[PDB]
Amino acid sequence: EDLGTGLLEALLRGDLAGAEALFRRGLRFWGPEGVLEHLLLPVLREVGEAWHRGEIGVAEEHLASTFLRARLQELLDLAGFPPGPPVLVTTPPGERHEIGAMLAAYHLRRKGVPALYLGPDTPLPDLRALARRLGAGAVVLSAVLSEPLRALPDGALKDLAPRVFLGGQGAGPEEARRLGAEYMEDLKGLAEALW
Amino acid sequence: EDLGTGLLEALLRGDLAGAEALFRRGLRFWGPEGVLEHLLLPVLREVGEAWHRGEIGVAEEHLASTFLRARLQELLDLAGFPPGPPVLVTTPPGERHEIGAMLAAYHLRRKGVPALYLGPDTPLPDLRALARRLGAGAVVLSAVLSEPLRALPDGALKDLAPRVFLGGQGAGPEEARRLGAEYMEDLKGLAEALWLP
Amino acid sequence: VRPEDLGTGLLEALLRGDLAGAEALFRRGLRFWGPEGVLEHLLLPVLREVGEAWHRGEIGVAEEHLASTFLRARLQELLDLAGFPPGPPVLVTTPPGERHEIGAMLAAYHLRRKGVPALYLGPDTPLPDLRALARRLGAGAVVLSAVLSEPLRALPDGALKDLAPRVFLGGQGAGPEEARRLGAEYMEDLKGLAEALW
Amino acid sequence: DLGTGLLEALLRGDLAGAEALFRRGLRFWGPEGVLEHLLLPVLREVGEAWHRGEIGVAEEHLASTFLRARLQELLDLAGFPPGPPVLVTTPPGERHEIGAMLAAYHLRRKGVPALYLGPDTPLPDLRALARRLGAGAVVLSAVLSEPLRALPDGALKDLAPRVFLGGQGAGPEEARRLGAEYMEDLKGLAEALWLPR
Ligand code: B12
Numbered sequence: 005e006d007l008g009t010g011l012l013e014a015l016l017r018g019d020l021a022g023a024e025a026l027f028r029r030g031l032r033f034w035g036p037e038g039v040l041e042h043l044l045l046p047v048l049r050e051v052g053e054a055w056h057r058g059e060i061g062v063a064e065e066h067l068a069s070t071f072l073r074a075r076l077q078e079l080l081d082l083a084g085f086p087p088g089p090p091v092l093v094t095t096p097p098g099e100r101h102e103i104g105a106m107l108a109a110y111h112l113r114r115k116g117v118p119a120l121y122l123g124p125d126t127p128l129p130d131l132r133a134l135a136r137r138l139g140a141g142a143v144v145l146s147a148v149l150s151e152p153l154r155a156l157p158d159g160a161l162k163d164l165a166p167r168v169f170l171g172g173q174g175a176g177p178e179e180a181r182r183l184g185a186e187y188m189e190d191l192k193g194l195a196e197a198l199w
Numbered sequence: 200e201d202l203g204t205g206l207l208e209a210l211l212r213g214d215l216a217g218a219e220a221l222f223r224r225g226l227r228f229w230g231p232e233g234v235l236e237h238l239l240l241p242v243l244r245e246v247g248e249a250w251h252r253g254e255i256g257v258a259e260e261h262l263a264s265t266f267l268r269a270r271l272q273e274l275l276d277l278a279g280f281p282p283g284p285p286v287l288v289t290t291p292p293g294e295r296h297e298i299g300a301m302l303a304a305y306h307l308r309r310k311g312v313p314a315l316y317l318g319p320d321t322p323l324p325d326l327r328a329l330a331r332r333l334g335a336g337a338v339v340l341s342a343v344l345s346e347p348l349r350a351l352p353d354g355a356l357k358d359l360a361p362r363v364f365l366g367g368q369g370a371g372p373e374e375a376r377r378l379g380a381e382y383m384e385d386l387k388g389l390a391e392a393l394w395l396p
Numbered sequence: 397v398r399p400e401d402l403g404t405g406l407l408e409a410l411l412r413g414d415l416a417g418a419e420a421l422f423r424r425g426l427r428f429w430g431p432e433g434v435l436e437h438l439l440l441p442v443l444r445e446v447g448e449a450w451h452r453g454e455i456g457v458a459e460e461h462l463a464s465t466f467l468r469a470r471l472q473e474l475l476d477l478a479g480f481p482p483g484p485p486v487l488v489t490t491p492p493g494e495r496h497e498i499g500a501m502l503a504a505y506h507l508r509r510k511g512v513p514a515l516y517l518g519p520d521t522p523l524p525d526l527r528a529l530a531r532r533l534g535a536g537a538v539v540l541s542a543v544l545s546e547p548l549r550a551l552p553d554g555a556l557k558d559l560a561p562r563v564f565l566g567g568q569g570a571g572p573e574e575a576r577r578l579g580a581e582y583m584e585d586l587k588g589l590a591e592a593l594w
Numbered sequence: 595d596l597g598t599g600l601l602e603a604l605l606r607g608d609l610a611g612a613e614a615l616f617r618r619g620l621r622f623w624g625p626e627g628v629l630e631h632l633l634l635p636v637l638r639e640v641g642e643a644w645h646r647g648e649i650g651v652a653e654e655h656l657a658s659t660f661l662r663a664r665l666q667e668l669l670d671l672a673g674f675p676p677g678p679p680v681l682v683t684t685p686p687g688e689r690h691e692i693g694a695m696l697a698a699y700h701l702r703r704k705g706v707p708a709l710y711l712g713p714d715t716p717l718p719d720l721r722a723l724a725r726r727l728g729a730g731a732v733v734l735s736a737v738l739s740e741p742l743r744a745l746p747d748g749a750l751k752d753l754a755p756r757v758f759l760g761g762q763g764a765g766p767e768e769a770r771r772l773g774a775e776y777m778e779d780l781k782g783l784a785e786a787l788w789l790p791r
């Protein structure tokens with residue numbers, strides 16, 4: 005059974021009940037991390053590709069994307085949330101794509117790290133202020149597009165927390181170096197990189 | 200509200216567990232509609248005013264708003280999504296505040312309306328195309344700011360779907376008339392106008 | 397359906413063998429009460445009423461079996477979705493002769509929700525084997541759930557004392573005096589377990 | 595090598611590592627193949643290691659509890675084929691439940707609505723539930739032979755119009771004595787419902 009085609013088709017026809025049932029079949033088959041890798045991310049990528057090819061309009065993407073963000077938020081709220089100093093997770097100013105940051109928070113919480121997901125697009129002064137006030141051990145940023153990072157001045161990220169991690173499709177090792185962050189490729193390596 | 204102040208204080212401490220416990224207590228005490236009017240909505244309004252007064256920063260508002268959207272998403276899912284020709288709910292192009300749209304969808308779904316929530320900020324021709332293809336009986340827009348409506352040409356909203364409804368703090372009767380939408384004074388006026396049976 | 401009617405609705409769904417509808421009612425409870433709350437406000441009251449219905453002779457053993465098997469699966473689902481930090485484990489089980497396992501699962505779930513790596517062993521673990529595993533894995537604690545008093549009554553004085561660096565005992569079958577006799581720390585509330593560990 | 599790695603991860607208390615290994619087998623072999631190549635060989639090896647004194651009871655418990663959870667999740671995934679239930683349990687005194695769960699799972703994958711009760715059901719109660727639900731069949735998994743030897747002649751007859759008995763603890767003459775149909779393997783079990791007898 006092709007859950008990815010089935011789920012995208014259900015979303016494009018506005019069949020949210022079918023879509024929710026199909027996502028849950030994927031959760032049961034692949035497990036929590038696995039459903040994100042094998043179902044949620046492939047469908048979001050395909051939605052993007054269909055839009056880029058001119059095949060679907062913006063409303064159709066929004067319908068699918070909004071639904072999948074809700075499913076990941078549901079999973080995130082069911083993960084543990086330890087006491088202790090938090091890790092703040094957001095996206096750079098100008099970055100409205102939020103699912104990468106949500107995935108980072110999720111992977112962290114599933115390994116017993118109290119990741120606070122702020123939502124996207126947080127001005128750096130306000131992010132630093134909050135990280136310092138809460139005694140955050142780290143700040144994690146997800147960059148989906150490269151332009152928001154290119155807009156930032158050299159060293160912009162270095163003072164945000166004791167550790168500052170940057171990843172996503174829009175990020176790369178050279179950009180992380182210019183901005184003063186540690187570049188991280190894999191979500192699984194985040195908790196490890198802390199412990 | 201005493202519980203409202205306590206929730207916001209928990210959110211500002213990063214105590215997500217304590218914040219959830221307070222929200223769940225409000226849900227048990229007031230029920231879903233009650234908790235929106237007496238807890239979720241007053242906290243969002245306060246967060247906004249406190250930011251405007253420089254008492255909290257943007258990261259703190261973000262934390263609070265993100266938490267409350269997740270709570271409202273849970274209530275949307277709890278309200279059920281019936282089958283049947285849908286009502287599309289979104290915000291005008293350039294409107295990034297989405298919770299008013301989510302609230303409209305919630306109130307509709309509570310009355311058995313299949314209110315499909317698209318998220319915010321949908322271009323008009325794309326919204327109209329989706330409404331046409333799905334056979335949607337109505338489109339509902341939430342405007343929080345007035346500037347996105349001011350930027351639209353006369354009659355821009357009139358033909359998005361068989362009925363087009365507009366509300367929110369950034370909308371008013373005169374702008375709705377200019378744009379060709381039916382202005383809805385409040386969420387119960389919206390729910391009333393669209394309830395089928 | 398009102399939240400106050402989900403318990404009666406869930407039990408009626410299970411009693412007609414409608415497990416898909418029972419799952420939907422459970423998920424509604426989860427969305428309304430939250431994870432800890434649905435266990436407190438829906439799972440535990442239904443399980444208690446199943447026991448009372450059985451005792452009154454209103455349902456039989458197979459009806460209880462179907463319901464507790466279902467509810468154990470719903471709790472397992474929540475358990476699987478919670479965290480699991482690396483780090484020295486807490487072993488969670490029930491005393492020898494105790495076959496009621498849901499209390500132990502709930503303790504494991506409360507610990508994993510607070511980022512404690514609770515390993516759920518299943519029920520009814522002989523004490524030498526439990527001690528051996530705790531020592532080998534370097535477990536920081538052993539947590540026991542006693543629903544009946546009889547299995548505790550069958551253990552000799554100080555039987556629980558050396559199981560792990562901390563040994564916690566709770567459940568409807570345990571009390572402070574019995575915990576003291578067996579060498580365990582007594583804990584009444586699940587919420588206080590993670591607090592106490594560290 | 596996946597079987598050996600799964601057991602090793604379980605014996606270290608590396609639950610995340612064990613889950614990842616199981617998920618890998620599920621993706622490689624699919625549902626049916628993961629049971630034959632991973633779940634069943636691990637359980638069998640777990641018993642052999644315990645008998646030989648290489649692992650203790652707590653280690654078997656950790657492994658079986660994990661595998662039972664994985665299988666219940668596959669059971670739920672297989673869902674609810676339409677029609678009158680087939681009740682699946684174990685005889686009174688039989689605490690090994692994975693064979694019953696496997697029977698239920700095999701049935702559901704073939705479109706038969708198996709309802710897995712849990713283990714160790716007194717026969718009068720099993721008969722009452724079968725009657726109340728209009729069950730078309732009852733299936734019992736016996737791992738030990740002793741619980742069967744304890745039951746009266748004819749004790750399984752008429753629990754439902756069709757009553758099947760299998761597992762390592764069952765054999766044809768014991769099934770005959772009890773008034774059940776003996777089934778040697780899960781393949782024959784679903785086929786046995788193709789046609790009446
Ligand atoms: C949904 C969506 C939107 C929604 C986002 C909604 C929301 N609230 O999140 C909206 C409508 C807002 C949107 C807007 C736009 N978007 Co858009 N959108 C998407 C879409 C379809 C899915 C986004 C998503 O969730 N992706 C899932 C992502 C996060 O997964 P991933 O990047 O594979 O990430 C992996 C790793 O990077 C890792 N990871 C991610 N973050 C981090 C962080 C750390 C620390 C680590 C360790 C790992 C990690 O996680 C994943 C593991 O596989 C994508 C398609 C796509 N391919 O992503 C486009 C896409 C990203 N969008 C795109 C574009 C062009 C736009 C717009 C400019 C469109 C326009 N207006 O003209 C705007 C820009 C808005 C802005 N300023 O940011 C392009 C970007 C192309 C490029 N430049 O690279 C894409 C690729 C579509 C396309 N095929 O053209 N978008």
Ligand code: B12
Pocket residue numbers: 240243244246247248251260264293294295296297298299300302303339340341342343344345364365366367368383384385386387389
């Ligand atoms: C959360 C929030 C944000 C978040 C939104 C996050 C998200 N994904 O939704 C973000 C960070 C994106 C944001 C951004 C900005 N925002 Co802002 N933010 C808010 C906040 C704090 C809550 C918004 C909300 O959820 N409102 C919904 C509820 C709480 O509002 P309500 O008035 O009670 O709505 C009632 C009715 O209107 C009705 N309703 C709503 N919709 C509909 C629809 C229909 C059909 C009907 C019948 C009824 C109805 O339901 C409610 C109860 O009945 C508000 C404060 C506020 N008072 O709203 C500001 C506020 C709306 N934001 C404001 C501003 C200035 C901004 C920014 C310009 C800031 C900036 N400089 O970047 C940007 C603009 C972004 C954009 N282009 O839209 C100002 C606007 C003042 C003004 N109009 O001039 C506010 C009022 C804060 C303030 N006090 O200054 N914001």
Ligand code: B12
Pocket residue numbers: 440443444446447448451460464493494495496497498499500502503539540541542543544545564565566567568583584585586589
């Ligand atoms: C399901 C069930 C069974 C199932 C259990 C299936 C399984 N778990 O795999 C099976 C069929 C095996 C079973 C068997 C029996 N059971 Co029974 N059964 C129940 C039932 C209906 C629900 C059990 C349950 O999960 N309860 C939920 C419990 C665990 O929650 P709780 O005890 O209120 O615990 C709270 C706190 O103590 C805390 N907590 C629990 N553990 C811990 C641990 C720590 C450290 C902490 C801090 C907190 C904590 O969490 C809960 C609230 O937060 C109950 C009804 C009931 N009232 O409990 C009976 C009941 C427990 N069973 C009972 C009986 C008599 C039996 C049998 C003797 C019946 C028989 N003749 O065979 C056998 C004994 C088997 C054995 N243990 O050796 C009686 C016990 C009465 C008494 N004490 O004398 C009960 C009360 C039914 C009744 N009579 O009303 N049973």
Ligand code: B12
Pocket residue numbers: 634637638640641642645654658662687688689690691692693694696697733734735736737738739758759760761762777778779780783
């Ligand atoms: C885990 C386990 C337990 C667990 C059960 C946990 C649970 N299920 O909740 C617990 C701890 C309860 C346990 C306890 C005991 N058990 Co034990 N344990 C096992 C173990 C390791 C796995 C059982 C299992 O799940 N196997 C399922 C699969 C592996 O069985 P299988 O042989 O492949 O079955 C196949 C077929 O029979 C068929 N099938 C099964 N059912 C049905 C039904 C139908 C209709 C059909 C068509 C086919 C079918 O499908 C299967 C796949 O092909 C087995 C070892 C083993 N089975 O080889 C023992 C084993 C069965 N246990 C054994 C023993 C000794 C005990 C105890 C007496 C130990 C004790 N002293 O306390 C108790 C007895 C409890 C009781 N009264 O039932 C012995 C049995 C020896 C004997 N006398 O026959 C075994 C064989 C271990 C050993 N090698 O010594 N056990």
Ligand SMILES: C[C@H]1O[C@@H](n2cnc3c(N)ncnc32)[C@H](O)[C@@H]1O
Pocket residue numbers: 051052055056061062063065066320321322
């Ligand atoms: C990356 C995603 O951005 C969305 N997208 C493209 N243009 C706009 C716009 N004007 N307004 C809102 N979202 C838009 C598309 O739906 C695409 O899939």
Ligand SMILES: C[C@H]1O[C@@H](n2cnc3c(N)ncnc32)[C@H](O)[C@@H]1O
Pocket residue numbers: 125126127246247250251256257258260261
């Ligand atoms: C209305 C809400 O908008 C948020 N806000 C204000 N300025 C910005 C910005 N540059 N980026 C993102 N959010 C912002 C504040 O947190 C306020 O509460």
Ligand SMILES: C[C@H]1O[C@@H](n2cnc3c(N)ncnc32)[C@H](O)[C@@H]1O
Pocket residue numbers: 446447450451456457458460461714715716
């Ligand atoms: C506490 C629970 O024990 C179950 N129970 C009662 N007697 C037996 C038995 N002989 N075998 C199995 N379960 C039993 C009942 O279903 C009751 O609810």
Ligand SMILES: C[C@H]1O[C@@H](n2cnc3c(N)ncnc32)[C@H](O)[C@@H]1O
Pocket residue numbers: 520521522640641644645650651652654655
């Ligand atoms: C068949 C399985 O039974 C378990 N087993 C053996 N003896 C006991 C006991 N006293 N209590 C609980 N489980 C036991 C072992 O772990 C073995 O593998």
